[PDB]
Design a protein around this ligand. Structure first.
Ligand SMILES: OC[C@H]1O[C@@H](NC(=S)N/N=C/c2cccc(Br)c2)[C@H](O)[C@@H](O)[C@@H]1O
Ligand SMILES: OC[C@H]1O[C@@H](NC(=S)N/N=C/c2cccc(Br)c2)[C@H](O)[C@@H](O)[C@@H]1O
Ligand SMILES: OC[C@H]1O[C@@H](NC(=S)N/N=C/c2cccc(Br)c2)[C@H](O)[C@@H](O)[C@@H]1O
Ligand SMILES: OC[C@H]1O[C@@H](NC(=S)N/N=C/c2cccc(Br)c2)[C@H](O)[C@@H](O)[C@@H]1O
Lengths: 810, 810
């Protein structure tokens, strides 16, 4: 059908058809009379993955032969989504499989909807890891993703009576064709026990053993025949475990609970023992695998030349004392040499500045669970603090501020301080975020070691986030500038010379309209909801948090509603306002916000006077597969975090690439996006970081805004009186209370300027040609935000390796 | 190499080789440089199972077309063992695969040793189910085995310091190639709740739901292209289960524990709730599957013409009230019609007379777990007791004796009484066992309904138990009489005309010697134990129980030892005495017996005066795969249960078929074996059932034997004084106490006659030619004990179906 999806040759289609039927028969044990769509999906999945094996075996063979420096990306989250379409794309098989399935009498898109998301992450941090793996393979890097194979990923969100309900994400129910169990590489991990001191150093004894069983998943590069590995560990009890008899067998569950479920808290910290076990489990198993592979290349001086370990936030921070443990206790290196090796091997990426999101483990937990690691941490702290003392003599408060050990009610280890001490590089994820680290939360560490601190602005993969999810847009671009931009996104700049091209303008606008039509149909079919596809699609999708200010969006929505009821026969640009995202199960306020959104929809969507001019939809169960649908259909991207709170954002980049305009604050990567497109092509509003600081010194008084803005006053009184909750009049008292008295994120302070800026959006949308030309200027400048650029920067400035766009032989 | 293993054609070997390499590459993701023997086994397993698919799909297709009466064999145990070699045999692929693997540079026998036993049973009852499935497929019956997919089967037995240790049998660790998950046929099973009465009958409400997920395993007939199904249910939690959040996900384990582990008690009863849940789980899921299949053929009158349900002991006895429940409550049939349907559908096989092995469930358990089923049981009891009252007016004690409800300390349901009431046929498993049922434990029921009571003498499959495990013997037989006996074992009679054939005698004796050489080498290699292959192989293998009298064997061993120390320079026929079997984890006495055996070995095997004339070996971890090795190597089969206690035995039949002679009592199937071979060709000793009865009336006094047999006295005093336990002098006080004062099984009463009869064994073994001629007379008469005969009798006399040896098209 379309060019970018590859060739549909005669021998290929024929071969795919026969292998499809082979798998349906031999692998699935079905015939065409009993098979359901699910069987058909599986036959296809097996037919496609067969094409990976040769490339996978020789890629791994190649790294053994050439022995390059290895990159290990350690994360507790890999938010992969679906794998079938992504594999076809990177292997140039999409059109061939479309044809083969068509000829078999099947619709391939229908089959793709059957695959479950691999939802092994929460949000931005997890999806970043997924985009990164794709870019690392596309760039020919010898990279491995290491993590945990959670039996249950992020929960499926059901909305019941306007309230979020959680249900288990049993994603392995039907089996996962995209994994290969490797029980032969099972490794032991130790917990509890005690430390014995002898003539020849410390020994960790009387431990409980849990087994780590690896599952390998292939990561194909873009049309370069490179297939990298993501290795996920699963927890297994050893066979003498607890070994009245029945109970001993049943208690095996305890050990295997380590890998059972993903913790659904993002940007918040909970000191639970099970979570600490997960963190150590992944670190301990991964490091033995690393060392094993290194020895199969005595001399650990060369270790940092052959190994890089990237820590995705502080979650795998135990890698630092664990590497020390192995080097000191098991390999018998002296402390100083072990430490030199550790520091040069490790690097740390920070993903937030929110205080409550920082990991500070109680000392008594580490004491019981990991007694040797606590000892090593104390020793690291001592030697680090002596360095501080020597650089800043007499500065006693600096010493307590920089200590890895935090004194107080309970003693805690600050895992972020550990990471900075034990890494040769520390980076933030957007320029403003990286500067904030140097100036505020890690100021003391920056003064001690300025050379460690870097920026690596986030990116998204243009394969999943353009080619895969928006084929129409990828095709009209390809027609004009060719296909090379897919793995070199800077080439999109060449589209600037098409901003006055009338055919292109018409094509860009047509692609959007078709995406909107397709999505409006999806909503009617799978969710029985009616929307006007002519309206402006105003979308905010991301995890529910107070700092992301879904509430500010709510206030705007209520303003438009109130203005309509005021002047019903006045003209307004119609909108479909879509908000989606999951709330963390214990986050009460976030759950109330979801309830508010649905409650506004109940009033707005059934007011006859409004008509189809305003619609408020809550998008249930937001996740990667839903993002791939809603993002290409959006006109307006809401990126309205309070300045200084969103480290980067990546959602923002997805919308930019897919032809939506952005309303947002000067926060995280928004700053760099506006800088790339030109501020005139962006809807910037609200306080900058400096304005926020000024307001804090002075003291934020919400009352002041309530007193001076009558439209804001009206909204508050409607919330309070029960306008949006007639049966439960005081349902939203908590939200009003928080807004009026306890608002950390200054919702009222940006209200006026936000509503105003939203009027300017409406104004531009009235002029289709001028809307579309600004869109073209956004897409054309989105090249910087490809994760290929990000990864090339990591490679050169942190890991010390050269990316390569060269093909491996097929 | 040998004829019975099929043809090794040029196109077959070539095709097998290429499919092997395809699987190693595409399925296992390996090349020949990284593959281990385990990978090679898996490539082979996949290559072989590919040959089943076509036959499996068309067999099942055929039953849908022709719609024959369906047989459902319900068991909580299926002791399958290994599957690779059995599949090759039934598909005539053995020689072809041997050649293909040889040419690939691999030894197939080495690869076969890699497969784990499917140990989903305890002993005789579980192995009977496995032999039965094989015979049902070989005989063209539309039969299904239904059971539970235990995650952990029977434990692996380790011997430590002479003591049994148990470890988890993690048989699914590397994955099972012989199963196909069928998550699309998942069914709900209900527990707990309460009964509501309405205008339109009772309703079972407020239940907890557990999901049952089926796994299908293929059961290939012998060279007839028939492939039947064994469907095993796995327990899964529903997705809203318990749905703080983390714990709700972790508590899913509770539901899934239902299918976690096989209960390791045989011939003993433990009233544990988890065991009751297993029994209902398999029954409830199986019956919905049965009814579903029946409706896909309103009119339940035809139900018994299209369905037979065989209950393997009382473990799936809940099928009776469950069928009633569905018919009465859900389909709205009247009680009397529902009951008529139930009775004509069900049949019950009894496997023991030991009182402590009978299932008697406390009423309060059924009350809480299955409230509706208790109600139905009471109603069944009432209507049954009215029938008894009417047939035997005024006989009030008969009424309490026959009641399904047992009064006392706790009220119990006698599940055996339930089975007899709700089945059209009740059968024992050997002629003497079936007579004992009619005369003693079920006498009252036999008087009420004599027509229900039948015999079905047990059998063993000659495929696994001759062709597979003893190819050498199968070949020398085939040379003389052809191959047709494999599926018609009565043909072995033709061997009688070869009893004076000098070539045959030499061949029979040679096969045995090679089996003994092979096994003696196995012991040295895998267990570092040295034995003389020239000695008589005296073997007792079976689960450890007091009724099986491993202790009597022990006493004989000690007698031989003491006689040697008495007259060291006298000649005695050398023996290797091998005893093996697992003890139930909570059975203290059985564990002491194992300890005794090893303790005798410690003394005997290191006495220089004994030399290699006497050796006592405990065979660790006895199981199906070990049986396939030790049985063809045995000269003497020990079948020495106290008369009236072993319902049938099947081990006995295995030894008969493979060229060992039998020392045993007139118990279970021994009676019929001796009858077939002629009593002169059997070593019969000891009390018959009648003698046991006489002794009980009189009162068994062990002291009397101790007083009058000096050799017995010596043994007891050695046990007591600490001769066999120097460091722990009183270690065996319990055993001596039990023998002297509390022996239910009258070990002393058979001692004299046993020792005497053992002298006669030694005498015959001194004459190789005459030993071998008697052996030939045993093998030649073992035809009756094929499970093909047993199953044909079930088919005609219970199920009402005709067996067929006709081939399905290939
Ligand atoms: O879903 C069924 C099962 O599939 C198995 N895969 C097996 S046998 N071969 N894969 C081969 C293969 C080939 C290419 C790519 C990948 Br990616 C895997 C996995 O080991 C199981 O964990 C899984 O449950
Ligand atoms: O860099 C990628 C993205 O990372 C996100 N960080 C996230 S999801 N941290 N989660 C932290 C977290 C997760 C689980 C538990 C705990 Br305790 C903290 C940032 O908020 C985005 O601005 C950024 O674009
Ligand atoms: O061991 C790996 C996995 O294999 C799978 N088998 C699959 S995908 N095809 N089988 C096809 C097939 C064909 C012929 C016979 C049989 Br018998 C199965 C099972 O569903 C899993 O439970 C198991 O863990
Ligand atoms: O018919 C086959 C064989 O069956 C055996 N019965 C067995 S294993 N019953 N197990 C009963 C049992 C099992 C588990 C729990 C409980 Br509570 C009882 C007989 O003992 C043999 O004589 C006979 O040859």
């Amino acid at each position: 059908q379309i060019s970018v999806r590859g060739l549909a040759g005669v021998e290929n289609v024929t071969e795919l058809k026969k292998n499809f039927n082979r798998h349906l028969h031999f692998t699935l044990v079905k015939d065409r009379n009993v098979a359901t769509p699910r069987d058909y999906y599986f036959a296809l999945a097996h037919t496609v993955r067969d094409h990976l094996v040769g490339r996978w075996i020789r890629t791994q063979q190649h790294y053994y032969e050439k022995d390059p420096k290895r990159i290990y990306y350690l994360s507790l989250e890999f938010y992969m989504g679906r794998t079938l379409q992504n594999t076809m794309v990177n292997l140039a098989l999409e059109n061939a499989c479309d044809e083969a399935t068509y000829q078999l009498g099947l619709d391939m898109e229908e089959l793709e909807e059957i695959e479950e998301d691999a939802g092994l992450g929460n949000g931005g941090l997890g999806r970043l890891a997924a985009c990164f793996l794709d870019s690392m393979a596309t760039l020919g890097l010898a990279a491995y993703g290491y993590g945990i194979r959670y039996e249950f990923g992020i929960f499926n969100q059901k909305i019941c009576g306007g309230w979020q309900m959680e249900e288990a994400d049993d994603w392995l129910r039907y089996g996962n064709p995209w994994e290969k169990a490797r029980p032969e590489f099972t490794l032991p991990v130790h917990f509890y026990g005690r430390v014995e001191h002898t003539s020849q150093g410390a020994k960790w004894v009387d431990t409980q053993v849990v087994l780590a069983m690896p599952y390998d998943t292939p990561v194909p590069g873009y049309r370069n025949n490179v297939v990298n590995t993501m290795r996920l560990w699963s927890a297994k009890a050893p066979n003498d475990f607890n070994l009245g008899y029945i109970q001993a067998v049943l208690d095996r569950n305890l050990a295997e609970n380590i890998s059972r479920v993903l913790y659904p808290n993002d940007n918040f910290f909970e000191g639970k023992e099970l979570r600490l076990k997960q963190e150590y489990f992944v670190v301990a198993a991964t490091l033995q695998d690393i060392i094993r592979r290194f020895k199969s290349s005595t001399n650990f001086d060369a270790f940092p030349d052959k190994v890089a370990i990237q820590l995705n936030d502080t979650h795998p921070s135990l890698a630092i004392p664990e590497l020390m443990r192995v080097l000191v206790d098991l390999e018998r290196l002296d402390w100083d040499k072990a430490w030199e090796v550790t520091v040069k091997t490790c690097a740390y990426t920070n993903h937030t500045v929110l205080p409550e999101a920082l990991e500070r483990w109680p000392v008594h937990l580490l004491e019981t669970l990991l007694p040797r690691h606590l000892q090593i941490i104390y020793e690291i702290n001592q030697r680090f603090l002596n360095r501080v003392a020597a650089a800043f003599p007499g500065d006693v408060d600096r010493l307590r501020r920089m200590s890895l050990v935090e004194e107080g009610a309970v003693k805690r280890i600050n895992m972020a301080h550990l990471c900075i001490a034990g890494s040769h590089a520390v980076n933030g994820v957007a320029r403003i975020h990286s500067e904030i680290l140097k100036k505020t939360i890690f100021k003391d560490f920056y003064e001690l070691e300025p050379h460690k601190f870097q920026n690596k602005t986030n990116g998204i993969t243009p394969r999943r986030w353009l080619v895969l999810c928006n084929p129409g847009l990828a095709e009209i671009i390809a027609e004009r500038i060719g296909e090379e931009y897919i793995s070199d996104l800077d080439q999109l700049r060449k589209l600037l010379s098409y901003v006055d091209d009338e055919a292109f303008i018409r094509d860009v606008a047509k692609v959007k309209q078709e995406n909107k039509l397709k999505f409006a149909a999806y909503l009617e079919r799978e969710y029985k909801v009616h929307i006007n596809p002519n309206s402006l699609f105003d979308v905010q999708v991301k995890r529910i948090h107070e700092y992301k200010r879904q509430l500010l969006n709510c206030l705007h929505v209520i303003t438009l509603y109130n203005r309509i009821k005021k002047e019903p026969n006045k003209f307004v640009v119609p909108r479909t306002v879509m908000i989606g995202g999951k709330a963390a199960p214990g986050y009460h306020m976030a759950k109330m916000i979801i309830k508010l959104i649905t409650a506004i929809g109940d009033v707005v969507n059934h007011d006859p006077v409004v008509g189809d001019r305003l619609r408020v939809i809550f998008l249930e169960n937001y996740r990667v597969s839903l993002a791939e649908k809603v993002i290409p259909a959006a006109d307006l991207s809401e990126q309205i975090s309070t300045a200084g709170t969103e480290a980067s954002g990546t959602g923002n980049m997805k919308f930019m690439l897919n032809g939506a305009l952005t309303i947002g604050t000067m926060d995280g990567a928004n700053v760099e996006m506006a800088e790339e497109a030109g501020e005139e092509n962006f809807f910037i509003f609200g306080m900058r970081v400096e304005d926020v600081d000024r307001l804090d010194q002075r003291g934020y008084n919400a009352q002041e805004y309530y007193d001076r803005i009558p439209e804001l006053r009206q909204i508050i009184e409607q919330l309070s009186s029960g306008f949006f909750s007639p049966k439960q009049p005081d349902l939203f008292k908590d939200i009003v209370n928080m807004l009026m008295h306890h608002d950390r994120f200054k919702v009222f302070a940006d209200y006026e300027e936000y509503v105003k800026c939203q009027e300017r959006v409406s104004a531009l949308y009235k002029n289709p040609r001028e809307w579309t030309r600004m869109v073209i200027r956004n897409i054309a400048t989105s090249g910087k935000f490809s994760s290929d650029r990000t990864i090339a920067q990591y490679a050169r400035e942190i890991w010390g390796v050269e990316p390569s766009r060269q093909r491996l032989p097929a």
